[PDB]
Amino acid sequence: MKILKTLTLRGPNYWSIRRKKLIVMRLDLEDLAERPSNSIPGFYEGLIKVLPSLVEHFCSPGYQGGFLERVKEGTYMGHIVEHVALELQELVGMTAGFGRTRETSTPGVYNVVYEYVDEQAGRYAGRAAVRLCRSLVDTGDYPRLELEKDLEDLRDLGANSALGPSTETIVTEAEARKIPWMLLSARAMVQLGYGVYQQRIQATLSSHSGILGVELACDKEGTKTILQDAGIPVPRGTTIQYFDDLEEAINDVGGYPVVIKPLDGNHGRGITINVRHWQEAIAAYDLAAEESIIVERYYEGSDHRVLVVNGKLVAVAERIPAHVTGDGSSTISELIEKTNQDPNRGDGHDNILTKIVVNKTAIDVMERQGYNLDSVLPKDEVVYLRATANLSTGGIAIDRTDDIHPENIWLMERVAKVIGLDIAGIDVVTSDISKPLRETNGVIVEVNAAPGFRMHVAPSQGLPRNVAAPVLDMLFPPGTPSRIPILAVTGTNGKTTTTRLLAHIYRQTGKTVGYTSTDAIYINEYCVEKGDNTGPQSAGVILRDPTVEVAVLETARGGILRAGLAFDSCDVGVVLNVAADHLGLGDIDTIEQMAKVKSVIAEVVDPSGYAVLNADDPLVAAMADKVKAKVAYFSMNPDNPIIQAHVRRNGIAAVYESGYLSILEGSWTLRVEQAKLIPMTMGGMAPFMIANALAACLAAFVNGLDVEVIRQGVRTFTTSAEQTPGRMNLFNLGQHHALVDYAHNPAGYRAVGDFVKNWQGQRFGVVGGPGDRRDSDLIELGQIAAQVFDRIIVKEDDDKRGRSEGETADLIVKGILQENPGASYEVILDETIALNKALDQVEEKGLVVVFPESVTRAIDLIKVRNPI
Template identity: 55%
Template sequence: MRIRSIRVLSGPNYWSIRRHKLIQMRLDLEDLQERPTNTIPGFKERLEALLPGLWEHQCSRGCYGGFLQRVEEGTLMGHVVEHVALELQTLAGMKVDFGRTRETSTPGTYNVVFEYQEAEAGRFAAKAAVYLCQALVDGEDYRRDLELDIQELREIRENVRFGPSTQALLDEAALRGIPYLRLNKGSLVQLGYGVYQKRIEATTTEKTSIIATDLAADKRATKELLQDMGIPVPKGYTVRRRSELAATIEDVGGFPVVIKPLNANHGKGITVNITSLEAAEIAYDAASQYSDVVLVEKHLVGDDYRLLVINNKLVAVAKRIPAYVVGDGRSTIQELIDEVNRDPRRGFGHENVLTQISIDDMTLRILESKGYTLDTVLPKGEHCTLKSTANLSTGGIAVDCTDIIHPYNAFIAERAAQIIGLDVAGIDLICPDIAQP
């Protein structure tokens, strides 16, 4: 088989009124034009063993196993490539199910059309499906290549897909019948068309002040302004050199402290509950990888809450819990992490509601501070935290607390958003109990 061309369709098209995101691959079957699947010994068995999920493809039969019936009775390879491309994307966490295969005016050349979620992943799936089908025709073992293909699709998806905040907005837009158009490779999106169109970039809207955005990105300036306006913030100072650490820690009131980059997000480079100068120097090195200026703050004891304020009104509250494992007296920490990651709710990147726990420098630093390694067997019932931050992207979990927040705490969050000037604001609050003022 030979791929003649691959086109990405991202708007209304010939193939579907409703499905606008389609890959159109022009595929020359060459010698396979005269070899339907029922004439290739063992092809159906090898295909079904490699991709058992194809049993769910109903195809024109309208029932489970419908596509595999077509393969058994005899269908051309272009049709098989269509379904394999769909299944590869589904296995990589991108559920798609629409496809069409039609012969062109050139005998033996077909338009293989299938749905995609991310264009780059769709292009890759088209090529991978052709290679996979050809390998099965030739009787080759494709299992290892299949694993590599699926992982490659996952990585492509994570590199190009919208972040969870943007995707949540677009999912809601779709429910409301609002069309959207991606305007760049990042998170710049147009909602609607014509005179009523609106543009967003992640959670930045057309009404978001650029001054507020720049202010929120500067932790030091944000803290100073909030403090001047009577909002409680942890005492802290910036440092530019390791030699300044000891004096700065004394200025904030001594240990324990938190050390973080001045300009970073998603919990990068943050270390909390530091209780010694040696640990502080290690934390400084970690933070300085993300920013030339490092922030040293007094460590606050309490739970980590994320409050969402939109148009100066609190709309949601989540208690964020860092990634952790609980000992059973038999398993090592590594084995406990592997067991947690087998939870079907956890996936690679943001493909599921939870993210798999990764082992990074932050994890190793925390374990070292406790005298543990990944090979340590935790006593039964011992709770071992693996991250300094509670971000979902690092394996943390979230508990909805919107209904229990005390009105005073809600007022603080709404006032903080007004002071900074953001129309959409995510505010972190550390306190022992969100239900108490």
């Protein structure tokens, strides 16, 4: 089994709208495609003994073991590679169960689709499933060592990409509130919201956290000075720059019950909390001396943490260090083993509490209390095994949020405001949080910028608090948006033209409008990037941009099939047409399948939004039954039964009638403008330009723009040369015209042909046809030219010469002579300055239609003739 191609999808896609995270593997069954399990002895028993959990897999049978009801009756490795990749991820804790297998191309090539949690772990499991499955169709087993190492790699791959718990907490609430989020390319930042409403976070810091506040909070001397000048209670203390002045400092502080700290801040190191004797001060000093606040009065009480988010109190918890108690006449080592077996204790974040570890530091803490491991405690005596509280070292946290006195609430909020920090943790020492700090003689010890949350969202006693909700409420205040409008445009033909017009209309309201097309990425007429900018990577440039208010995006099937949509949902989804272009590519062979790709846009429109469908197109109108959104329709025929049935139920439609482009809203008709007065439409002679204009007008209308704005936008819009090169460029050369265009699929040849038919001038000449990379549609082109032009000259011998030489021209000649063999059917082959220069063979007011391989040359040569 060989893997030919792998795609990773991230967003709504062809296989599923909801299953955003999928891996699609193109698997080549060189062997096995001819051997449906029964032909592979041992391939049932080996599979179940290697992976015994594969009973939880269901297939067509809706049963436990439904997978295993088959296997012996093979699936030609569909299902088996798929189910193995899914199970290998489940075995390491990643939950994913969606999957599908479909045969493509020539026999033996399959598309295997499975769900992933982590992108690299997902791809790894796929490759591993293929190796496991290929060993079991060679031999009857798979060595355990080659299974365990793969499970170890999956566990590491899924660990390295994990978000820390403080970011998981904010992100989970953001999803509940429908706020979109993205990871950024630098410094582990996460973006919340689109365009002008975006915010950024990093762990517990946000876009609202100021630098002056955060730096002050990290300066212990600075913090103390600022707070005591505000009337806030803080510890009494002094400074010694590593001189043996300890004995003098206690004279200002209050005697021996003091705290000695390293002068600098380098984790909880070199600190003695309760110094009772001179020689202890010296030992504390010798450790303090290791670093670059050295004698503070010691205050009695518990260590309380107060969380304040926007100048408002959110949560309070009491912290206690790891300890054991006199739970009967047992020794300390016995008590530790007794309580360290508690089911709520374990490693990491897989538990509430963690394990108590006896080390040299536990021994040192116990010696100061007069105890050691073999000591027996008096009933209810408590012995501490650590100097400070921390859940990660085996301590506990008790929620006391509802027991805090109103005056203490007021003081804590004032502290955060004085030091200038939005999200802050305040460390308070007090014997009783329910009484005012001035009465209990409590103090504020530390103010911490960007605090963690485990102790408030997963306390060991008391009720858990939703800490994230108050954070998202300051970033995205009630009543405000987190998204900008998104208008997504798709369909086989007309996307770029529709996209530029729609962006032009929104721009008349004075907003910043960003858009992407196949030519470039633009913001308010400035070009950001050039080249084919359709697809999800370009949509991301606009959505991440801090200045954009409206996004208009043309969407192509290449981007959808290769990586999914970039935005998840949108306000307006426009589908212009479905036609037989790009068939055979991307495993889509039929028109019915192509329609399933295009329908992705209609199916992601938010229920409060609209889908805009073409009622004159039978594949597109039919999408109306999948759409959860409201549906609006457009047409070139006011009597289309769909439109009539729809407006009679008070829907909205846009139609072309009586020379006007108008909107039907229930019983009322709103005329916008005349087709002949809108410059993009060639005097009303180009029906395909009219249809593109109706779609743009209707999308603007249903999304709330006024009619006058729409009128102004259509009247001033242009598609001249060098703005839209190769797209209906009509050149005026005295009493003569030439048109440069660039059709691909047949619909574009018919659309141009109708413009030509309306040309009430003289001869209709055409100077070309298709290149060598088209399929067998050369005859169809010849058939189209035959009934539209009276001067048909063939130049299909281009410079690229993808296939042989002049055979393309020979097929065009065969086609054109099939329908109307009376149009001077010359074949000249050259198309540089030979056929595209021979314009003097056409009389006054005739029209020359050019279909060049290269537009750049066609519009250069036409200028050599000095056009108006």
